[model samples]
Target: KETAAAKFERQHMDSSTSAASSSNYCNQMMKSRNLTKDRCKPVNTFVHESLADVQAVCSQKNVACKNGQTNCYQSYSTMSITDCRETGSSKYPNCAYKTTQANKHIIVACEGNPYVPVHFDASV
Candidate 1:
């Protein structure tokens, strides 16, 4: 299984980013399945300047950190991981593991941006 960090890097780096819009390799699969439609919702895409930022955000937002010393949840974009984890933490403890799934389909609702998501219906 791929760790969230690895998966995030793979998906973001491998994705195409143009001035007009960004496209991921997965888009091809969406297209092949005829999911490429305006009505399709775009998946949440987290924006980060560096990898450490990703970790920091995930770590802070990790439900395992109840002390509130870490504020990582703020970094997550609607397009990023639906859930996250913290370093040196477990599923148990006062800081229990908390996970919530993001909406699978993300629609590019914004305009005038270098990268906007375009989504399709995978079930179709």
Candidate 2:
């Protein structure tokens, strides 16, 4: 099965811009799995400091406080140019961070089995 990030890129990532399409893709992926109604929850798109940066960006830190902005979480890490990986599930995965290059966004992959993207910023 294609990772949520891959599915999202193929569907939305602009060929010119590397940024994730938008929450629209996230919402579609969730709804397809019967996650929630077709609502676009507020998710903070954090541009990671670096791949190994590992700096945490909590919801209380940068999340915009206008929308329902429920619980927030970190997603998308920065990826350097030299990283590589077959899939997010690789034992020693490559490129698990967001690249700084324009139009070259890195997909956020969790670190474990069932290889799934963590969902957040939804109305509960």
Candidate 3:
């Protein structure tokens, strides 16, 4: 039983690799991280920052979630992130992805008593 916070950590957090130069980064990571378990995730983001820093976003400015929830918050500082997008020709079990790195303010959905980021909504 994985908590939402733990799921976010597994799916999005990657503090070690700050920059992804090789195009195969996403291809390797998406599978290694188990995002390709049942089916290929169309789009996913990996944040290169400390877990503490990412968790602190819950205290940042409030924003509206995609589903109209008010639990979303936008990060105050620009973060290092890599977006993994599946290629059109990519097939399941043979997932291929395009790796893109950027420095942008991240938008996330937060929850629970400790108030931590649970879902990565977007980067803006």
Per-candidate TM-scores read 0.27, 0.20, 0.96
Tens digit of lDDT per residue, candidate 2, span 35-91? 233332222232213322322223122332234443343334332221111223322
Which candidate achieves the best lDDT against the true structure? 3
Cα lDDT tens digits for candidate 3, 31-120: 988999999999999999889899999999899999899999999999999999999999998999999999989999999988898999
Which 10 residues in a row give candidate 3 its minimum summed lDDT? 16-25
Predict model 3's lDDT versus the native: 0.93
Mark the regions of model 2 whose C-alpha exceeds 4 Å error after superposition. Answer: 1-6, 10-12, 18-37, 44-107, 110-124
Pick by lDDT: 1 or 3, better one:
3
Q: Relative to the unseen true structure, what is the C-alpha lDDT of residue 75 in candidate 1, on a scale of 0 to 100? A: 33
Lowest lDDT 10-residue stretch of candidate 2: 92-101
Residues 31-102 of candidate 1 have per-residue lDDT tens digits of 332323432323323232344433343323222123333222433343332322221342222222223333
Clashing pairs in 2: 17-103, 18-103, 77-98, 78-98, 79-97, 79-98
Model 2 TM-score (2 dp): 0.20
